[PDB]
UniProtKB/Swiss-Prot annotation:
PTM info: Monoubiquitination of Lys-89 by BRE1 gives a specific tag for epigenetic transcriptional activation and is also prerequisite for histone H3 'Lys-4' and 'Lys-79' methylation. GlcNAcylation at Ser-81 promotes monoubiquitination of Lys-89. It fluctuates in response to extracellular glucose, and associates with transcribed genes.
Subunit structure: The nucleosome is a histone octamer containing two molecules each of H2A, H2B, H3 and H4 assembled in one H3-H4 heterotetramer and two H2A-H2B heterodimers. The octamer wraps approximately 147 bp of DNA.
Upper lineage: Eukaryota, Metazoa, Chordata, Craniata, Vertebrata
Glycosylation sites: 81
Compartments it resides in: Nucleus; Chromosome
Protein keywords: Acetylation, Chromosome, DNA-binding, Glycoprotein, Isopeptide bond, Nucleosome core, Nucleus, Phosphoprotein, Ubl conjugation
Organism: Xenopus laevis (African clawed frog)
Protein name according to UniProt: Histone H2B 1.1
Keyword presence, Ubl conjugation: yes
Boundaries of the shown chain within the full protein: 33 to 123 of 126
Domain of life: Eukaryota
GO MF annotation list: DNA binding; protein heterodimerization activity; structural constituent of chromatin
Placement of covalent cross-link Glycyl lysine isopeptide (Lys-Gly) (interchain with G-Cter in ubiquitin): 89
DNA sequence: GGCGGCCGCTCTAGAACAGGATGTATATATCTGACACGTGCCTGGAGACTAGGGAGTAATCCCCTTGGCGGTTAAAACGCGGGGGACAG
């Protein structure tokens, strides 16, 4: 069977930000579980946000609101700016 | 001639300082065991298409929160007495 994993994307992100450092199997498993847990948290927050105002869809504003609700401080603003840059580069 | 005051002497102890002790910080030697590259796939997302439906926007409406007052008696605040408790020892 095939199991979905986030190892290679995290690895190439690491090579982008720090090409002189490697990673282990346990460190990869911690990072995979962390990114998966953040995925469920942000996706559930967006689902609840859609359910509150009778919204049948989840847009980028759902993810931005979930990020500002979950991430505290300047981390939320930096993530919002990165998402806005990615959205503008997408279109 | 006796006694209080003064200064030197020895006793005692706080503390800076140097030496021993033992568990870690490193310098190689070498094992070693997953790390990442390569290969071979192949299974899930992307181009493209069909269709439609829920929100973007406009309009209404009516509703409900903000400003803005006097009044009046509940209470915040200042201060005096004092009292029991936080903390040094």
């Amino acid at each position: 069977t095939r199991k979905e994993s986030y190892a290679i994307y995290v690895y190439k992100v690491l090579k982008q930000v720090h090409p002189d450092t490697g990673i282990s199997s346990k460190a990869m498993s911690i990072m995979n579980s962390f990114v998966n847990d953040v995925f469920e948290r942000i996706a559930g927050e967006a689902s609840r946000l859609a359910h509150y105002n009778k919204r049948s869809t989840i847009t980028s504003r759902e993810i931005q609101t979930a990020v500002r609700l979950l991430l505290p401080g300047e981390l939320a603003k930096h993530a919002v700016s990165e998402g806005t840059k990615a959205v503008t580069k997408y279109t």
